Design a protein around this motif. Structure first.
Motif, PDB file in Angstrom:
ATOM      1  N   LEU A  38      -7.773   6.437  10.362  1.00  0.00           N
ATOM      2  CA  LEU A  38      -6.528   6.264  11.091  1.00  0.00           C
ATOM      3  C   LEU A  38      -6.303   7.425  12.041  1.00  0.00           C
ATOM      4  O   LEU A  38      -6.865   8.506  11.883  1.00  0.00           O
TER       5      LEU A  38
ATOM      6  N   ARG B 292      11.221   0.179   8.084  1.00  0.00           N
ATOM      7  CA  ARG B 292      11.057   1.618   8.245  1.00  0.00           C
ATOM      8  C   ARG B 292      12.208   2.412   7.626  1.00  0.00           C
ATOM      9  O   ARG B 292      11.995   3.434   6.980  1.00  0.00           O
TER      10      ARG B 292
ATOM     11  N   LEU C 110       2.274   8.117   6.216  1.00  0.00           N
ATOM     12  CA  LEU C 110       1.196   8.813   5.527  1.00  0.00           C
ATOM     13  C   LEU C 110       1.174  10.321   5.778  1.00  0.00           C
ATOM     14  O   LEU C 110       0.893  11.123   4.892  1.00  0.00           O
ATOM     15  N   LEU C 111       1.570  10.758   6.992  1.00  0.00           N
ATOM     16  CA  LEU C 111       1.739  12.154   7.354  1.00  0.00           C
ATOM     17  C   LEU C 111       2.860  12.782   6.531  1.00  0.00           C
ATOM     18  O   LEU C 111       2.680  13.830   5.905  1.00  0.00           O
ATOM     19  N   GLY C 112       4.020  12.090   6.437  1.00  0.00           N
ATOM     20  CA  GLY C 112       5.127  12.461   5.556  1.00  0.00           C
ATOM     21  C   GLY C 112       4.705  12.647   4.107  1.00  0.00           C
ATOM     22  O   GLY C 112       4.966  13.701   3.525  1.00  0.00           O
ATOM     23  N   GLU C 113       3.961  11.664   3.522  1.00  0.00           N
ATOM     24  CA  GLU C 113       3.381  11.747   2.170  1.00  0.00           C
ATOM     25  C   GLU C 113       2.539  12.996   1.947  1.00  0.00           C
ATOM     26  O   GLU C 113       2.704  13.723   0.967  1.00  0.00           O
TER      27      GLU C 113
ATOM     28  N   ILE D  73      -7.188   3.122   2.481  1.00  0.00           N
ATOM     29  CA  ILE D  73      -6.952   1.858   3.165  1.00  0.00           C
ATOM     30  C   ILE D  73      -8.066   0.827   2.962  1.00  0.00           C
ATOM     31  O   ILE D  73      -9.257   1.139   3.003  1.00  0.00           O
TER      32      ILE D  73
ATOM     33  N   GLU E 118       0.789  -1.225   0.000  1.00  0.00           N
ATOM     34  CA  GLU E 118       0.000   0.000   0.000  1.00  0.00           C
ATOM     35  C   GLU E 118       0.830   1.289   0.000  1.00  0.00           C
ATOM     36  O   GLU E 118       0.525   2.243  -0.716  1.00  0.00           O
TER      37      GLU E 118
ATOM     38  N   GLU F 109      -0.268   1.036  13.632  1.00  0.00           N
ATOM     39  CA  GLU F 109      -1.065   2.216  13.295  1.00  0.00           C
ATOM     40  C   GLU F 109      -0.242   3.518  13.354  1.00  0.00           C
ATOM     41  O   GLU F 109      -0.276   4.346  12.444  1.00  0.00           O
ATOM     42  N   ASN F 110       0.582   3.681  14.418  1.00  0.00           N
ATOM     43  CA  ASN F 110       1.514   4.779  14.620  1.00  0.00           C
ATOM     44  C   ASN F 110       2.511   4.928  13.474  1.00  0.00           C
ATOM     45  O   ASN F 110       2.593   5.986  12.850  1.00  0.00           O
ATOM     46  N   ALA F 111       3.265   3.854  13.164  1.00  0.00           N
ATOM     47  CA  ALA F 111       4.231   3.824  12.089  1.00  0.00           C
ATOM     48  C   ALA F 111       3.648   4.084  10.704  1.00  0.00           C
ATOM     49  O   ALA F 111       4.250   4.776   9.883  1.00  0.00           O
ATOM     50  N   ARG F 112       2.413   3.602  10.443  1.00  0.00           N
ATOM     51  CA  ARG F 112       1.687   3.907   9.223  1.00  0.00           C
ATOM     52  C   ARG F 112       1.237   5.361   9.156  1.00  0.00           C
ATOM     53  O   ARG F 112       1.329   6.004   8.113  1.00  0.00           O
ATOM     54  N   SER F 113       0.779   5.927  10.293  1.00  0.00           N
ATOM     55  CA  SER F 113       0.349   7.319  10.395  1.00  0.00           C
ATOM     56  C   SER F 113       1.502   8.278  10.163  1.00  0.00           C
ATOM     57  O   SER F 113       1.407   9.180   9.334  1.00  0.00           O
ATOM     58  N   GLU F 114       2.661   8.052  10.822  1.00  0.00           N
ATOM     59  CA  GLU F 114       3.884   8.809  10.596  1.00  0.00           C
ATOM     60  C   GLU F 114       4.360   8.866   9.140  1.00  0.00           C
ATOM     61  O   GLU F 114       4.766   9.918   8.645  1.00  0.00           O
TER      62      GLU F 114
ATOM     63  N   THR G 178      -2.702  -3.201  17.895  1.00  0.00           N
ATOM     64  CA  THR G 178      -1.878  -2.948  16.709  1.00  0.00           C
ATOM     65  C   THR G 178      -1.388  -1.508  16.667  1.00  0.00           C
ATOM     66  O   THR G 178      -0.891  -1.024  15.654  1.00  0.00           O
TER      67      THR G 178
END
Ligand SMILES: *[C@@H]1O[C@H](CO)[C@@H](O[C@@H]2O[C@H](CO)[C@@H](O[C@@H]3O[C@H](CO)[C@@H](O)[C@H](O)[C@@H]3O)[C@H](O)[C@H]2NC(C)=O)[C@H](O)[C@H]1NC(C)=O
Ligand SMILES: *[C@@H]1O[C@H](CO)[C@@H](O[C@@H]2O[C@H](CO)[C@@H](O[C@@H]3O[C@H](CO)[C@@H](O)[C@H](O)[C@@H]3O)[C@H](O)[C@H]2NC(C)=O)[C@H](O)[C@H]1NC(C)=O
Ligand SMILES: *[C@@H]1O[C@H](CO)[C@@H](O[C@@H]2O[C@H](CO)[C@@H](O[C@@H]3O[C@H](CO)[C@@H](O)[C@H](O)[C@@H]3O)[C@H](O)[C@H]2NC(C)=O)[C@H](O)[C@H]1NC(C)=O
Ligand SMILES: *[C@@H]1O[C@H](CO)[C@@H](O[C@@H]2O[C@H](CO)[C@@H](O[C@@H]3O[C@H](CO)[C@@H](O)[C@H](O)[C@@H]3O)[C@H](O)[C@H]2NC(C)=O)[C@H](O)[C@H]1NC(C)=O
Ligand SMILES: *[C@@H]1O[C@H](CO)[C@@H](O[C@@H]2O[C@H](CO)[C@@H](O[C@@H]3O[C@H](CO)[C@@H](O)[C@H](O)[C@@H]3O)[C@H](O)[C@H]2NC(C)=O)[C@H](O)[C@H]1NC(C)=O
Ligand SMILES: *[C@@H]1O[C@H](CO)[C@@H](O[C@H]2O[C@H](CO)[C@@H](O[C@@H]3O[C@H](CO)[C@@H](O)[C@H](O)[C@@H]3O)[C@H](O)[C@H]2NC(C)=O)[C@H](O)[C@H]1NC(C)=O
Ligand SMILES: *[C@@H]1O[C@H](CO)[C@@H](O[C@H]2O[C@H](CO)[C@@H](O[C@@H]3O[C@H](CO)[C@@H](O)[C@H](O)[C@@H]3O)[C@H](O)[C@H]2NC(C)=O)[C@H](O)[C@H]1NC(C)=O
Lengths: 427, 162, 162, 427, 162, 427
Positions: free
Chosen positions: D401, E85, C89-92, C67, B87, C82-87, C78
């Protein structure tokens, strides 16, 4: 007279409008950025040089009818350590009236076609008719230690010390003698004549090297006879049954002592033999046993234990007419780091019914190519970071990831025309 | 607003007619429009498109073989992880696609500005303020010969100023 | 260095005064600065800003509901995932914001270049090399009428040359 | 005379300078790109057409005082399989002096309001007064099997074989008869006159289908009597107590055998009944028991086991005045795939004390809407890939999220002015 | 095709000769090339390069300390996760490097267009159409003095028109 | 005459061509974007004000020979709660002929140099000479509770109730008295003269506060005597040995009861003492024991249990000539949230053999600086999001991530020349 000239762009017939950041782009045709890779059925290897195989009769280059009889190519077979009629289990326990061989070699990836030569058909009955559990457990440990070693070798003899009171045994259900791994020895003991024997004490030394081979861990079989009861043992011995394996220090590491544990047999006057699989480090070990029976182990497999690596295990079963077990399958599936190769169709050989199967050949065909990834779902030598769907859990190499073709980007192709400002596309 | 002939920034929809790159000309305050194929700088534009495509190829190779060499011996599942990585990498592919299209587009447009410069260089009398990628010339000064030289690159008898 | 009237590339801070798009005019070596609204040109700019905003809307919708549809039955946490995915996606979101701002900016600037072209096209005497987004015209030749037509889009009496 | 005209850009009053790549941008106002979505308290469903509910008296559309009495809407109640005074546990064990019904249906998402009709208040004492553990364990299994099935049905009849020696039982504490699931049967045995009986053997067949309903797994209750001692059983029997359930092959799958396991009771001359929950596949089973007691199971729940799917369980407790257990809550909270809905204010009904609670209505309100995600923290039918904080672990649908508003991008609004090159901003 | 002196867009390889920014001049249809350092124009470019570097510095600070505060008390390994990461963040760093290089490049080029404007502004007769970043002047009209003022920023005796 | 002037860009000597989107860039020199950070050896702290330490003689500010003797700086030592000859274990069990002290304090990060004063050398033999196991288990619990607490304090006295039949004991192997934590008491019992005793019942009350210190959880030692056999106990007591700890409700929470449990000793006529570690909440507890022996605990450690936080544990061992154990090391390594600091070189002190070690000083120097991350691999106060390789599992703060310098981006430096469109680079 003044004439105005302009360099004009006009877009025609079939066209796609590729959208961007800093102008867009028109193109007449378009195609995918990457193409999804597929895993191919059967077995193959990474590097095509850091691998070694342990063979049977269908991987044997000295087989008279080889091409026919072979489930592999000649190229593939070259990396094998083979011998017709051979088996790791046959060299491990050395039953009388069967072949015996010094299996050994090194490599990152180890390929096994072991098993078929000690299937129910083989009919070994040296106080145990169903070998399947022993075979399974032996294979399981071989696979375990092998996917954690770089070098491995069979150990067909070791250093021993036997006490003068006992002398070598023989059994009529074990042809004319006894096995070449648990070595049987007995003394005269007769309870009825009141001629009672003495307990045995014997030593043995596991070598930390075997020529070039470095031995950091040995796979040995601790065996013993399981008697039904007191009365049954008391026909042939005055005391109680026992066979126990001690270390150098004085700790016990395996066996059976019926002076302190109840009897558990079901075979009447004759006992039945149980062989437990043990992993032992090199040193000077000792064994103790009841007067009438001494069963010293005299063989083992030596592992250097240096590095982890792939293990392929091929389903070693017979052609039609010969009773086969699934020990290989079971053992692999219950140990990590090995990939099982199994047949969807029956085994039908060319040479005879048991050698040169069509299916097996188009599966082990991959072993001649250099794969960029190998998995339990198959192998791939082609590049591309994507595949239609996920590959089964154990896999090695440059793995492709799951993706849908409709979500892969498209690249413009043919005639391309750039857009610029807001002026750019008139209608 | 320019009439029936318009600049190089422009692109017009002409599905069943002539397309690609063409020379659109007409008299100022007079005569009809003449349109004809540009099939000679298109090797220039086109050749530059090959160089652009060379960039593409490279950038595509740079996205091939990215993931690390594994040796997974455990039979544990990682699908939920593979999904989250896929993804993300899919999102990345989206961005660099839009970026690539623009960069290509821009560099392509700048190769049309090499033609302008060269055509302007070919005859002094070609320098005039008109419309982006349009120019004005006089038929009492330059005949077929020099015109054919100037922008159809036939190298035929250059313009005489006296 | 240009004086009190400067080009279209420029934007000046006029915190307490007139802002937006305006026509800044004065005589070359003469009469003082006159500033007055460009709201007749703005009808184009404004309309292109709507087209630009349409792009924005789309691009925002394209980031909605990304998603996959879950059906989590397990009660285990999880959050670290969720944190690592948010960080990430925030960068993107950071990147595509800067990219969007430039692309919008650029396309907006290109809509000011359509005004230039149109105004230049309206009268031949309007074609002159001055400063980016500035032009020079002669008040003997063209009155209020034609000026009002030329750059205030009121179509009043076009300029006469003889 | 020559006059110079410039198209000037000037920025005034409130303005923000948005940074980019390839120029920056001025705007007079600015607002956030995405709004953070919130999970709404209560229960709701995905797809609003693939879900089914199992009801009571408060979900009953045939209730005369429905609107008042209802904890749900009419729209919502229609997807329920209800009956006033009903309960899955009441149809499972069929105790005398209670209702009997055939709960059944199919769906991706199953909604339970089961429990209240067999709480301590309900008064059942068929050799067991505290039903809570049985209730709990039964619910736990119902939730488990349901979150792994598409279709489910109660099974209120089966094929059996009872031996002529025994005749149907009855019990004074079980009103005037006995349960409709464990069926009691007895024969005469009298130790005082030495008129001793014979041990029983009886058969039964679990069916693989129940009309349209497909049964791949049955939830059955294996029950037995727990006696204090040898002597206590030996008042009424000449042997020892036992009730055991065997398979088709002949292995035992459950029960209690006091011919080999000690007597564990504490209820004196009368025993206490224990019902263990078993999961059984369709086939022909057999049971064996002591002369004086035969307890054949005659009911079960049938599950097709096709697919995993959401399960909502509502806290089925009584209105004020009738004692309630937390079996529902406990069972859900200890099984995966279910979401528990529980009250934060007492149950106060309109119709009568126990029907039509205010709170419950504004909670089960969501069941008429189509949610895009449902979680143990609430439901949402509103769009946006973000929320203020993480939703509790079991959740289904398109999840939002966690993100902070302060880091969400801002979009220009009002008057926009582009910056260009290095010349662009004067001061 | 332009000859031995070429525009500002261009950059030529002069590995063992004069580099940087220089004034390349020669006569139109006459006398050979003169090349000499542009260090008086550079005072602008140089300061803007500092402003550009200031942007860089900021953007680098903005990538420092991005991962949040940890409190790991558990003794178990997360290397395979940290790796995945790192592979992502490394990819991100690649992209923003290419993006930064272009943005810097562009903004640097626009500061060379500020020199054009200023030099053109210095003398009205210096405004002429030639090649991108090339201009034509007449030494009959303007001597060393005014030339030295015009593009070498030495303010010596400006050009007379009569 | 017409002269053409061009502003030319020319690239010379050393140059690098940095590739982009929207043009490339030439630069004469280039350097790395981020410098990889290094994890420095030793101990250091985050925030330099929310930390507290528990000390010994080498951290004591009142030591006459401090600078020399110290393994820490004066600056560092001030954050410690020290005392020469001290130890948490010595204050916990209070053995006679050893120092007594009230260790206590609060903080996010707790630093321990505990252990050396109760190593085998210390010579306590109050029915137990080998303290190591007790020490280990005690330390493990201290570390465990501490990495989950904000405040902690020793509790050297509590509320108790003793029965008049028993009077205070003494033991010759415990100097001239007995421990200040398990308090010994006995009554006069002689089996031969049939002067048998009565079983004891005694109470004790664990307090919820101890000054400002909040007690949510107490770490207490439940101790008892282990006798070899029936007869051996029956020399000194008629019945059987037992010591058992009950709760407020009446359930048992610890001890040994040889009225039901067999005698497990191996120390002959004299018993050997075992102290199990228990974690107890505040309340009114009771104990029961055999006539001849009562062992009431009168001390414990009190923990507030408010929040998780780092714990540093320094290897507290002796200089050359006093026997040391690795209880500290072992205990830390088997508890989460603590970081162990240990010596790679022998302990060689300046002041005397056992105080002021060179190594320990160059390790504990970091405690004067403010680190931005602390790990089991070391500490760092310098910024940068990257480091050469992954830091060991327990770590706190702003962690740097693993990366290779060769893969870090390069920044143009020196003279920079911009590339434009297609025209831009001539050859
Ligand atoms: C990657 O592995 C694939 C197979 O999985 C390899 O493809 C096979 O390549 C061989 C030559 O190396 C081809 O063999 C030739 O086939 C023709 C036609 O039948 C025959 O006339 C030749 O004598 C020879 O046997 C074979 O066709 C081809 N397989 C397919 C399906 O086309 C491939 O070469 C591997 N590449 C690398 C770089 O390892
Ligand atoms: C859009 O218009 C362009 C013209 O600018 C199309 O290009 C032309 O496509 C035709 C397709 O049939 C090509 O014709 C072929 O010519 C060869 C000789 O070169 C001849 O042997 C064939 O029989 C055929 O007639 C033509 O060459 C080509 N133009 C050039 C300069 O190569 C373009 O294909 C159009 N778009 C689409 C989607 O077709
Ligand atoms: C920055 O300056 C611009 C001027 O170019 C401001 O735009 C103007 O804002 C005023 C605010 O009151 C608008 O005035 C209103 O006009 C309507 C008729 O359209 C009238 O009915 C009202 O009573 C009032 O006079 C005006 O329309 C608007 N200009 C345009 C072209 O629409 C802008 O608002 C300034 N920035 C900020 C943050 O205020
Ligand atoms: C590429 O060419 C440029 C010219 O545009 C080089 O710049 C020149 O580099 C020399 C290097 O030594 C500088 O000379 C030095 O000047 C200092 C005083 O500033 C003096 O102390 C030294 O002894 C020496 O004479 C020269 O000033 C400089 N040009 C300018 C305008 O400052 C550039 O260095 C070349 N590239 C490389 C990689 O060298
Ligand atoms: C980050 O921590 C490092 C150490 O891990 C700090 O570097 C050290 O800074 C101290 C002062 O705070 C320096 O001390 C001075 O040493 C000189 C040289 O012998 C001496 O003459 C002075 O009297 C003083 O003791 C020390 O040199 C330096 N470390 C090194 C290797 O040179 C650093 O300051 C810390 N930074 C921050 C912002 O916390
Ligand atoms: C964004 O578009 C750039 C073009 O506008 C592209 O650079 C490419 O063009 C330059 C010339 O300006 C190439 O440089 C030449 O390449 C040829 C071979 O193709 C060589 O023979 C010659 O010596 C010189 O190096 C670049 O090499 C070329 N790019 C590539 C990758 O080949 C940018 O690459 C592009 N940005 C991205 C990230 O794709
Ligand atoms: C892409 O390049 C942009 C430059 O073309 C860059 O913006 C930078 O330049 C602007 C001016 O156009 C700076 O704004 C000024 O900064 C000075 C101080 O350096 C102030 O005195 C003045 O008031 C005004 O704020 C920007 O600050 C400057 N950028 C930074 C980060 O400092 C863009 O930032 C660049 N894009 C990216 C994403 O880096």
């Amino acid at each position: 007279e003044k004439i105005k000239i302009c360099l004009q762009k006009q877009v025609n017939s079939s066209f796609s409008l590729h959208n961007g950041f800093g102008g867009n782009l028109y193109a007449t045709e378009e195609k995918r950025m990457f193409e999804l890779v597929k895993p191919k059925a059967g077995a193959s290897v990474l590097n095509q040089s850091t691998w070694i195989g342990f063979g049977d009769s269908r991987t044997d280059k000295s087989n008279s009818a080889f091409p026919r009889s072979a489930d592999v190519s000649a190229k593939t077979a070259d990396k094998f350590r083979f011998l017709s009629g051979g088996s790791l289990m046959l060299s491990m326990f050395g039953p009388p009236g069967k072949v015996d061989y010094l299996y050994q070699g090194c490599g990152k990836h180890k390929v096994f076609y072991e098993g078929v030569n000690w299937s129910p058909h083989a009919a070994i009955n040296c106080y145990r008719k169903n070998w399947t559990d022993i075979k399974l457990n032996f294979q399981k440990n071989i696979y375990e230690l092998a996917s954690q070693s770089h070098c491995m070798s069979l150990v067909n003899a070791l250093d021993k010390t036997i006490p003068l009171q006992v002398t070598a045994g023989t059994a009529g259900n074990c042809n004319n003698s006894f096995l070449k791994n648990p070595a049987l020895y007995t003394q005269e003991v007769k309870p009825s004549e009141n001629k009672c024997g003495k307990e045995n004490l014997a030593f043995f030394t596991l070598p930390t090297q075997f020529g070039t081979y470095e031995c950091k861990l040995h796979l040995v079989a601790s065996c013993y006879f399981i008697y039904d009861s007191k009365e049954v043992y008391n026909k042939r011995g005055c005391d109680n049954y026992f066979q126990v394996i001690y270390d150098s220090f004085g700790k016990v590491v395996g066996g059976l002592d019926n002076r302190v544990s109840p009897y558990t047999g079901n075979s009447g006057d004759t006992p039945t033999m149980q062989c437990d699989m043990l992993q032992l480090k090199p040193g000077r070990y000792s064994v103790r046993s009841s007067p009438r029976f001494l069963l010293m182990p005299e063989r083992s497999y030596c592992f250097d234990m240096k590095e982890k690596g792939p293990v392929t295990a091929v389903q070693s079963i017979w052609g039609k007419g010969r009773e086969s077990d699934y020990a290989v399958d079971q053992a692999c599936l219950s140990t990590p780091g090995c990939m099982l190769i199994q047949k969807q169709k029956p085994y039908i050989g060319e040479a005879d019914d048991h050698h040169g199967d069509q299916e097996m050949r188009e599966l082990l065909s991959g072993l001649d190519y250099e794969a960029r990834c190998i998995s339990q779902s198959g192998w791939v030598n082609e590049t591309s970071p994507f595949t239609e769907k996920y590959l089964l859990p154990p896999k090695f190499g440059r793995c492709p990831l799951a993706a849908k073709e409709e979500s892969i980007p498209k690249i413009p192709d043919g005639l391309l025309i750039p857009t610029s400002g807001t002026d750019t596309t008139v209608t | 607003i320019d009439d029936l002939i318009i600049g190089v920034l422009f692109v017009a929809i002409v599905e069943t007619g002539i397309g690609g790159y063409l020379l659109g000309s007409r008299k100022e305050s007079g005569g009809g429009v003449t349109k004809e194929s540009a099939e000679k700088g298109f090797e220039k534009i086109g050749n530059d498109i090959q160089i652009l495509k060379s960039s593409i190829n490279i950038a595509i190779e740079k996205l091939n073989d990215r993931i690390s060499h594994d040796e997974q011996a455990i039979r544990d599942l990682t699908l939920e992880i593979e999904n989250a990585r896929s993804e993300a990498l899919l999102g990345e592919l989206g961005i660099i696609r839009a970026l690539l299209v623009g960069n290509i587009s821009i560099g392509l447009q700048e190769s049309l500005w090499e033609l302008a410069s060269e055509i302007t260089n070919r005859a002094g009398d070609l320098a005039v303020e008109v419309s982006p990628g349009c120019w004005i010339i006089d038929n009492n000064i330059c005949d077929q010969s020099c015109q054919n030289f100037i922008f159809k690159f036939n190298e035929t008898a250059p313009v005489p100023t006296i």
